[PDB]
């Protein structure tokens, strides 16, 4: 099971999933800044392709679907990350990428 | 934005044809009322002076008589069932409401009737289980297929004995379809973590066995559902108190009214009388044509009330009450705001799986031709649904294009230059009328069926081409300014 | 809801206290301990409070505590949307 | 109240034609139907077709068309009915029925033509 | 188009007894139901007895009921009167352009 990024960058970042069926666990999107902690951004339904933002987060950032691959549109490092089903949230990673 | 005279002139032209229409109808009953009552019983009560009333709908006769019998004590019993639950234990709340919703259906329709409610739900839960779209869709629309046929349809009228069950049942089951397909298609969707415990059978069991929309009530969300009756925040039974006096006194004045309409104009008999149809004055018409819509109206105003009355007692939200069918002038907005609950429904698991709106033209079409072939499918799927659907179908297919045509940069900013803005509201007002005229023929095969669409449409268009429709398009020309200057305060 | 952990760093006990209650409205408390090395991205420790992913802190009620290699320690909470992550925790090498 | 009188029976030729009329009285409303059902000496009913006498709309079974013909008289409410190329196997009674409001069922009968092709 | 069939063709009771018509539709008349009974004596001409399915006519006795709900239809007699003595034709009305059954005889000898 693999996340890989669209390495750096200096905007469009580029999530895509092997190891498991794409359709059946959400993606979600979070980004460290050097200065401060993980933050949340949202996530996207990778079935009905609903996402939801968080509200500052609004209007800037878009999530698009382009199923096993997945993709957002700010010095922080932004990570994908699967969500399971139930009990529990972020199971896998990817290694991010850095913008600057 | 129109001066203010202008548009009281428009008020007092779109109240006068109601009303003249309205005493045209009238008159002609009370001049055929010894006619009409050899070929169609009419009621004596001692409602309105000794007036008699035409119960010919078969909607309000059907469930005014299940009302009277059974239905009232059954929706009283739940909200003082409900209340004491609250207070007592509010936490089991949920399964002793689907506990009393499934011990109601029983003892109104049987065994067979918990029965076969339930047996339509397992085997939804079960296909859900596979998490697809097209699986859930296809299985519930094969249980729907099997309500209309005609070897299930004698097996299930042997196990009442009355015929007034047996379309009880039917109507129950119509209706649960859909509560049961919304489940299903939203287990197949989960993918949060804290929603996945929301899934589970006994979920599903009491979401389908809420009492209050059981037999004809109008589709309820299931996110909503699922919110309230997990809250265990309740709300100052004192409050709860004061709101059904309210509820009750709107509630009956608009049964006052419904029936005040059917002791006055007897426009269901005459619709069944196409004969006398052809031989009416072109005033009758129109004012037939406003008392059917006025009284459908009115009457889904007493039909969807009383649960949404209910509703709110148990705390929820319920779809929002029909607006008032005297104020729509476009087919977009018709269907928007009538049926809430049931647009909710479609837009939600009919209209964007297909990916409407999103793929431009073509995509728009085929998504709202989707939508409207299964309402027209669901409600029975006869010839004259289906004509129904096609004209509704192509009605909002041009509005929509149009719509777009005039928001073109290019155009838009040309008739922004060159016309005032209250020219462009006038133009608009007269592009409406075309449309609710149209509107008006299609719901009017709804309500009477093709024979009536085809008296209408030559005794309006044909027959009186010159005359007759420049009138009915004048003063439809002015009922939709009134209209469209009441929307500004909504949409 | 907003957390705060203390302390920030600590040589070789987390505690995430938060404003409001973290139980969800379905009746379980949705909170997780992700480690993450330097140069590395979060790893999930406990899936759920008490209970391991793969340490085994405990906690209950409002606060929160984990128990028992070198990284920083971020406590989240799902149950409450948005969802909130912690301030983070740096384990000093001494 | 409403009352149908026919005219008398008559004795035709084979390959010839026959007029027989229908008059209504007592009618409150003003769309009402006139049909025409034929009956064989010891066979059932069958209905030909309806003639309006005050509107001059008419239908046709499909066994009886292009060879009935079905006219009016507003003024004195009358109705025709007429057959040509007459058989033996046109020998019936046929009654002039009148229907109700709704045009649903035939409420008033006359007495019947006696027609004899021979 | 709708064909119309009638059973039994004759049909011999003895006076007092019960009688059952049966009438049957190719195609279901269900709209209130267009089906329509009507009474014909030997000497005279048809007369109007049950109209809507069920629905009595005015002066007709209270021993004669109909019923019936897709295309199978029924006409019961609850004890015959001797006076009762025609043939019984049932007629589907303005669902289609009017189609007559074959008729039932009653022979009380
Ligand atoms: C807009 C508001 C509400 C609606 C209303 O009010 C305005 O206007 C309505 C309409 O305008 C009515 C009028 C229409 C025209 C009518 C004409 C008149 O006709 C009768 O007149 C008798 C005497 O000549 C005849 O005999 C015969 O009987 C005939 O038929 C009578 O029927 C009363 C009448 C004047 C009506 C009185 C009641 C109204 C005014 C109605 C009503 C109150
Ligand atoms: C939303 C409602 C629907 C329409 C309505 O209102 C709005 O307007 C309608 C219409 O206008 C009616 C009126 C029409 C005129 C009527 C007249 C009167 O009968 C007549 O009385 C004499 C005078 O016309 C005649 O001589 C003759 O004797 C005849 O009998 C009686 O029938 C009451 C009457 C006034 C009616 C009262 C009820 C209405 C008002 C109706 C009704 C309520
Ligand atoms: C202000 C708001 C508007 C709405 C409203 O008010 C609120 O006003 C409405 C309207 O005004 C109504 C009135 C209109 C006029 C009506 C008149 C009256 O009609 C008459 O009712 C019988 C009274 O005896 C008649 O009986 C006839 O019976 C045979 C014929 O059928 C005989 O022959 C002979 O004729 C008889 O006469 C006949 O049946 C006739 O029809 C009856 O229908 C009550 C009546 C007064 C109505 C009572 C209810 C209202 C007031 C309605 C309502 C409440
Ligand atoms: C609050 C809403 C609106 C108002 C309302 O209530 C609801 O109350 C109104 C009012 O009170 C009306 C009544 C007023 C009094 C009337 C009296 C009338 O009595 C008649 O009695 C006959 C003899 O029996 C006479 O002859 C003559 O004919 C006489 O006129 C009767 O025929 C109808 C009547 C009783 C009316 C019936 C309809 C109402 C009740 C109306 C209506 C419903
Ligand atoms: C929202 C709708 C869209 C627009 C509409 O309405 C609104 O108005 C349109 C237009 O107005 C049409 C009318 C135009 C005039 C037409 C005239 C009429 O008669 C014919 O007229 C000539 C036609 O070639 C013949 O010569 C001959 O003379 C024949 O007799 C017949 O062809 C129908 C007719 C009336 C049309 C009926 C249908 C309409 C009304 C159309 C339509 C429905
Ligand atoms: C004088 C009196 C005269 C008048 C008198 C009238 C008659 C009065 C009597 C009636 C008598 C009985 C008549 C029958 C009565 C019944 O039986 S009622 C039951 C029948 N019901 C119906 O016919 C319903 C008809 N069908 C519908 O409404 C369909 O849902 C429609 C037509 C497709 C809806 O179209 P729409 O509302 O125009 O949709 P649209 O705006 O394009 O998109 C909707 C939303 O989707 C959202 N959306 C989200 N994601 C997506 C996505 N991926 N893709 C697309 N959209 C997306 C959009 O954002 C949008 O919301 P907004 O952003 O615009 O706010
Ligand atoms: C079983 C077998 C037998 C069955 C037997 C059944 C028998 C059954 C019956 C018989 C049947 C027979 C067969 C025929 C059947 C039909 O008759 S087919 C009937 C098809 N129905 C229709 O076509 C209905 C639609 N017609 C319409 O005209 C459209 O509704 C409308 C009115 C154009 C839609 O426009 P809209 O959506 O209201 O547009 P909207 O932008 O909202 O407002 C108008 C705009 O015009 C702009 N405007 C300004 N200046 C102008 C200007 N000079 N020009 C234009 N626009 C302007 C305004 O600014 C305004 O935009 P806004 O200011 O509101 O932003
Ligand atoms: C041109 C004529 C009419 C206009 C412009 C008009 C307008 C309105 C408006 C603006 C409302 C506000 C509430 C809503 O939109 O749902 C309303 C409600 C209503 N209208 Fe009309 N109306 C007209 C004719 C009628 C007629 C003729 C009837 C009955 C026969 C009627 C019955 C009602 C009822 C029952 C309500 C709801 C009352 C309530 O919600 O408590 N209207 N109407």
């Avoid at chain 2, 697809?132 to 629309?141: A, F, I, K, M």
Wanted: glycine share 8%; net charge neutral.
């Amino acid at each position: 099971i693999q996340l890989v990024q669209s390495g750096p960058e200096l905007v469009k970042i580029s999530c895509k999933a092997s190891g498991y069926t794409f359709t059946n666990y959400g993606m979600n999107w979070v980004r460290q800044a050097p200065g401060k902690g993980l933050k949340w951004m949202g996530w996207i339904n990778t079935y009905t392709g609903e996402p939801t933002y968080a509200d500052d987060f609004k209007g800037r950032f878009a999530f698009s679907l382009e199923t096993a691959y997945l993709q957002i549109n700010d010095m922080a490092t932004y990570f994908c990350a699967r969500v399971w089903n139930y009990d529990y949230y972020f199971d896998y990673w990817g290694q991010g990428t850095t913008l600057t | 934005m129109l001066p203010r005279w202008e548009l009281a002139l428009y008020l007092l032209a779109s109240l006068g044809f109601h009303f003249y229409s309205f005493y045209e109808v009238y008159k002609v009953s009370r001049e055929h009322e010894e006619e009409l009552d050899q070929e169609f019983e009419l009621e004596t009560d001692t409602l309105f002076g000794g007036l008699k009333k035409d119960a010919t709908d078969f909607e309000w006769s059907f469930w005014m008589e299940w009302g009277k019998q059974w239905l009232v004590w059954l929706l009283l019993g739940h909200m003082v069932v409900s209340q004491m639950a609250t207070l007592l234990a509010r936490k089991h709340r949920p399964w002793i409401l689907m506990l009393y919703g499934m011990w109601a259906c029983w003892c109104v329709l049987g065994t067979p009737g918990v029965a076969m409610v339930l047996l339509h739900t397992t085997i939804s839960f079960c296909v859900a289980q596979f998490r697809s779209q097209l699986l859930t869709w296809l299985c519930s629309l094969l249980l729907l297929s099997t309500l209309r046929l005609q070897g299930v349809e004698e097996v299930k009228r042997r196990w009442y004995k009355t015929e007034n069950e047996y379309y009880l049942l039917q109507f129950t089951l119509t209706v649960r379809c859909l509560y049961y397909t919304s489940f299903s298609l939203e287990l197949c969707w989960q993918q949060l973590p804290a929603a996945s415990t929301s899934y589970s059978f006994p979920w599903m069991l009491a979401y389908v066995f809420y009492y209050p929309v059981l037999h004809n009530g109008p589709i309820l969300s299931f996110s909503e559902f699922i919110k309230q009756m997990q809250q265990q925040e309740h709300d100052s039974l004192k409050a709860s108190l004061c709101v059904l006096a309210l509820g009750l006194g709107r509630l009956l004045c608009w049964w006052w009214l419904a029936e005040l309409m059917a002791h006055l104009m007897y426009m269901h008999a005459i619709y069944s009388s196409i004969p006398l149809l052809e031989t009416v004055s072109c005033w009758t018409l129109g004012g037939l044509a406003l008392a059917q819509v006025l009284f459908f109206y009115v009457k889904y105003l007493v039909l969807f009330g009383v649960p949404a009355l209910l509703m709110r007692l148990d705390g929820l939200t319920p779809p929002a009450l029909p607006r008032c069918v005297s104020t729509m002038f476009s087919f977009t907005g018709m269907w928007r705001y009538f049926d809430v609950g049931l647009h909710n429904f479609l837009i939600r698991y009919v209209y964007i799986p297909v990916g409407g709106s999103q793929h431009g033209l073509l995509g728009t079409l085929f998504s709202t031709a989707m939508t409207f072939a299964f309402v027209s499918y669901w409600h029975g799927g006869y010839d004259y649904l289906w004509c129904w659907a096609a004209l509704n179908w192509l009605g909002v297919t041009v509005e929509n294009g149009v719509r777009r045509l005039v928001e073109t940069p290019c155009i838009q900013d040309s008739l922004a230059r060159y016309f005032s803005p209250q020219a462009r509201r006038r133009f608009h007002a007269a592009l409406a009328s075309c449309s609710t005229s149209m509107l008006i023929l299609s719901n009017l095969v709804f309500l009477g069926g093709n024979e009536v669409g085809k008296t209408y449409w030559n005794r309006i268009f044909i027959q009186g081409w010159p005359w007759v429709t420049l009138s009915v398009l004048g003063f439809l020309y002015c009922y939709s300014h009134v209209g469209i200057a009441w929307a500004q305060t909504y949409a | 809801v907003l957390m705060t952990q203390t302390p920030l760093s600590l040589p070789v006990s987390i505690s995430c206290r938060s404003s409001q209650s973290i139980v969800h409205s379905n009746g379980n408390t949705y909170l997780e301990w992700y480690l993450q090395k330097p140069g590395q991205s979060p790893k999930l420790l406990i899936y759920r409070v008490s209970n391991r992913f793969s340490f085994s802190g405990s906690g209950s009620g409002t606060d929160f505590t984990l128990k028992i290699d070198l990284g920083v320690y971020y406590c989240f909470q799902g149950s409450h949307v948005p969802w909130t992550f912690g301030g983070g925790t740096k384990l000093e090498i001494k | 109240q409403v009352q149908l009188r026919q005219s008398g029976a008559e004795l035709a030729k084979p390959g010839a034609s026959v007029k027989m009329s229908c008059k209504a009285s007592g009618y409150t409303f003003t769309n009402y139907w006139l049909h025409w059902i034929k009956q064989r000496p010891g066979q059932g009913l069958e209905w030909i077709g309806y003639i309006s006498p005050n509107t001059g709309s008419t239908e046709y079974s499909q066994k009886f068309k292009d060879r009935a013909t079905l006219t009016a008289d507003k003024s004195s409410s009358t109705a025709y009915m007429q057959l040509s190329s007459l058989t033996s196997e046109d020998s019936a009674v046929y009654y002039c029925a009148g229907s109700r409001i709704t045009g649903t069922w035939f409420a008033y009968w006359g007495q019947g033509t006696l027609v004899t092709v021979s």
